[PDB]
């Protein structure tokens, strides 16, 4: 991977997303989607291992099918209204079609089996990229079309998203896999409030984003892929594993940490709109997230784990790659609750 080639892949991915959240013509939205697709496949193949080839192939198939169904919705609402402008749909089945087309790109409904696997395949930096940047475009499209989305569809889809997100992560030790399942749960979390008011899903997107960088940067600052590998890191990096623990507390949403604020906001606006049964389901099922969160915490910091003899010469070497933004990345993802009113800035 040529450094300059890697940079030009960075910015074509980012420009593909930018085209999505700045364009108005529907065709341009599709173009940005595949620009990002065509641009992110090579970086996922940076390591060039057969697992990476597997992950890239599954991503390609899923996202290509999803973009083709995206054009199907595109063509249908064009046919029934002759207007490429992105707005409320004028044909119902076109709206549904776009809903599953985007969802397959998000990993919400049973169209979510790709993400845990593809996260397993690629390197952790590619994992950060996949689970942070490749959500902004589909969320932005879903925000722009919130006028006419079948509320039943979006609600049930978010419900499965969070539910299988919680359940799938229980029996996973690979940190990449449990992070993928947690991201699926957060996907359900924001997409549940997507139909009602998009400011709150934007806020939850921001919090999940900052938490995800604050997470992945800690992982590859510890260089761990399995739970046992992270457990061995309780020694070398005690500060890193303590911050590991505090952000793992911010994971579930235990007050007064940052992660509680989006849950609180989403539930409060859901209750404003007579949806009282609905919020209790994610409120209960967040304990499923908190379960393997607590398991990760126990393996990381709360309980000392048996280290290794050779491991001691690691004591002689220091992490040289700075991996900047980590301090503020932690801080914004831990203590921003007294700043909840600032949500009105996004509105």
Partner 1 sequence: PFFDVQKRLGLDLDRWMTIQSAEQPHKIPGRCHAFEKEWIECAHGIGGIRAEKECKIEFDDFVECLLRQKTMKRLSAIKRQRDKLIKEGKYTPPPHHLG
Partner 2 sequence: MMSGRPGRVPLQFLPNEARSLPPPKLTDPRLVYMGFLGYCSGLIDNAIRRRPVVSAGLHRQLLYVTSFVFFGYYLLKRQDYMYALRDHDMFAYVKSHPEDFPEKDKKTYGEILEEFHPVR
Partner 3 sequence: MTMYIAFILSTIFVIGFVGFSSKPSPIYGGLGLIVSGGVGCGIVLNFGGSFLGLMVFLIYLGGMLVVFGYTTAMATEMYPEVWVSNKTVFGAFVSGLMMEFCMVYYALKEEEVEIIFKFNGLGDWVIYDTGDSGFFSEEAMGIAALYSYGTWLVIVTGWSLLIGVVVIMEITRGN
Ligand X SMILES: CCCCCCCCCCCCCCCCCC(=O)OC[C@H](COP(=O)(O)OCCN)OC(=O)CCCCCCCCCCCCCCCCC
Among 130, 159, 211, 336, binds ligand PC1 (CB under 6 A): 336
Judged by beta carbon distances under 5 to 8 A according to partner kind, the member of partner 1, partner 2, ligand X, none in contact with residue 86 is partner 1
Residue 149 as a binder of partner 3 (CB under 8 A): the answer is no
Candidates 246, 245, 213; CA nearest to 231 is 245
Question: Nearest CA to 189 among 214, 173, 174, 206?
Answer: 206
Q: Which long-range contacts (CB under 8 A, 24 or more apart) does 82-88 make?
A: 84/25, 84/26, 84/27, 85/24, 85/25, 85/26, 86/23, 86/24, 86/25, 86/26, 86/29, 86/141, 86/144, 86/145, 87/144, 87/145, 87/147, 88/145, 88/147, 88/148
**Would you call 276 exposed, middle or buried from its count of C-beta atoms within 10 A (0-12, 13-18, 19+)?**
exposed
Q: How far is the CB of 342 from ligand PC1 (least distance, A)?
A: 4
Among 93, 228, 284, 339, binds ligand PC1 (CB under 6 A): 339
For position 344 contacting partner 2 by CB under 8 A, the verdict is yes
Nearer to ligand X, 239 or 277 (CB): 239
Q: Residue 246: which of partner 1, ligand CDL, partner 3, none does it interact with, CB under 5 to 8 A by kind?
A: none
Stretch that binds ligand CDL, among 112-120, 187-195, 306-314, 318-326 (CB under 6 A): 318-326
Number of chain positions touching partner 3 (CB under 8 A): 19
Among residues 189 and 260, whose Cβ is nearest to ligand X? 260
Over the window 68 to 107, marking each residue x when it contacts ligand PC1 by CB under 6 A and - when it does not, the resulting string is ----------------------------------------
Determine, following the binding rule CB under 8 A, whether residue 129 of this chain makes contact with partner 3.
no
Among 206, 220, 246, 335, binds ligand PC1 (CB under 6 A): 206
* Cis peptide bond upstream of 100, omega within 30: no
Q: How far is the CB of 329 from partner 2 (least distance, A)?
A: 9
Q: Residue 271 and residue 274: Cα distance in Å, rounded?
A: 5
Give 316-320 contacts, CB < 8 A, sequence gap 24+: 319/221
Among 37, 104, 129, 237, interactor with ligand CDL by CB under 6 A: 129
326 belongs to the binding site for ligand X (CB under 6 A): no
202 closest CA partner among 163, 144, 157, 275: 144
> Between residues 230 and 336, which has the closer beta carbon with respect to ligand PC1?
336
**Partner interacting with residue 221 (select from partner 2, ligand PC1, ligand CDL, none; CB below 5-8 Å by kind):** partner 2
Query: Are residues 144 and 198 in contact, defined by beta-carbon separation less than 8 angstroms?
Result: no
Tell me the closest approach of the beta carbon of residue 25 to partner 3, in angstroms: 9
d(CA 176, CA 219): 9
Nearer of residues 94 and 200 to ligand CDL, judged by Cβ: 200
Out of 18, 78, 220, 335, point to the residue binding partner 2 (CB under 8 A). Answer: 335
> With contact defined as beta carbons under 8 Å apart, do 232 and 225 qualify?
no
Rg (CA), the chain: 20
For ligand X, the binding residue among 76, 122, 209, 243 (CB under 6 A) is 243
Q: Which of 233, 190, 236 is nearest to 211 (CA)?
A: 190
Nearest to 128 by CA among 84, 175, 85, 94: 175
Give the whole-angstrom CA distance, residue 207 versus residue 189. 12
Residues in the site for ligand CDL, rule: CB under 6 A?
1, 3, 6-7, 10, 125, 128-129, 132-133, 209, 213, 323-325
Residues in the site for partner 2, rule: CB under 8 A?
197, 199, 221, 239-240, 243, 318, 322, 326-328, 330-331, 334-336, 338-339, 341-342, 344-345, 347
């Amino acid at each position: 991977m040529n450094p300059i080639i890697y940079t030009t892949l960075i910015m074509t991915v980012m420009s593909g997303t930018m085209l999505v959240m700045i364009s108005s013509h529907w065709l341009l939205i599709w173009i940005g989607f595949e620009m990002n697709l065509l641009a992110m496949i090579p970086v996922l193949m940076k390591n060039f291992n057969p697992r990476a080839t597997e992950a890239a192939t599954k991503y390609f198939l899923t996202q290509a099918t999803a973009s083709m169904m995206l054009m199907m919705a595109i063509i249908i609402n064009l046919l029934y209204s002759g207007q490429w402008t992105i707005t409320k749909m004028f044909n119902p089945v076109a709206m549904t079609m776009m809903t599953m087309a985007l969802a397959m790109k998000l990993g919400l409904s049973p169209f979510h089996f790709w993400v845990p696997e593809v996260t397993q395949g690629i390197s952790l930096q590619a994992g950060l990229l996949l689970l942070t940047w490749q959500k902004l475009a589909p969320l932005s499209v879903l925000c722009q079309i919130s006028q006419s989305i079948n509320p039943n569809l979006m609600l049930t889809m978010a419900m499965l998203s969070i539910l299988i997100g919680g359940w799938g992560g229980l029996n996973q030790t690979q940190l990449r896999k449990i992070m993928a399942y947690s991201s699926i749960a957060h996907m359900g979390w924001m997409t549940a409030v997507l139909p009602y008011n998009t400011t709150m899903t934007i806020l939850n997107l921001l919090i999940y984003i900052t938490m995800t960088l604050a997470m992945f940067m800690l992982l590859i600052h510890s260089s761990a892929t399995t739970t046992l590998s992270l457990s061995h890191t309780w020694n070398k990096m005690p500060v890193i594993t303590s911050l590991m623990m505090v952000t793992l507390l911010s994971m579930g949403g235990l007050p007064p940490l940052s992660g509680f604020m989006p849950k609180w906001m989403i539930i409060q606006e859901m209750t404003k709109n007579e949806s009282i049964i609905m919020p209790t389901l994610m409120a209960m099922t967040a304990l499923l997230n908190l379960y393997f969160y607590m398991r990760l915490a126990y393996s990381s910091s709360l309980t000392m784990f048996p280290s290794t003899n050779n491991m001691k010469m690691k004591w002689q070497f220091e992490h040289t790659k700075q991996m900047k933004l980590l301090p503020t990345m932690i801080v914004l993802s831990t203590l921003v609750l007294p700043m909840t009113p600032a949500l009105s800035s996004l509105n």
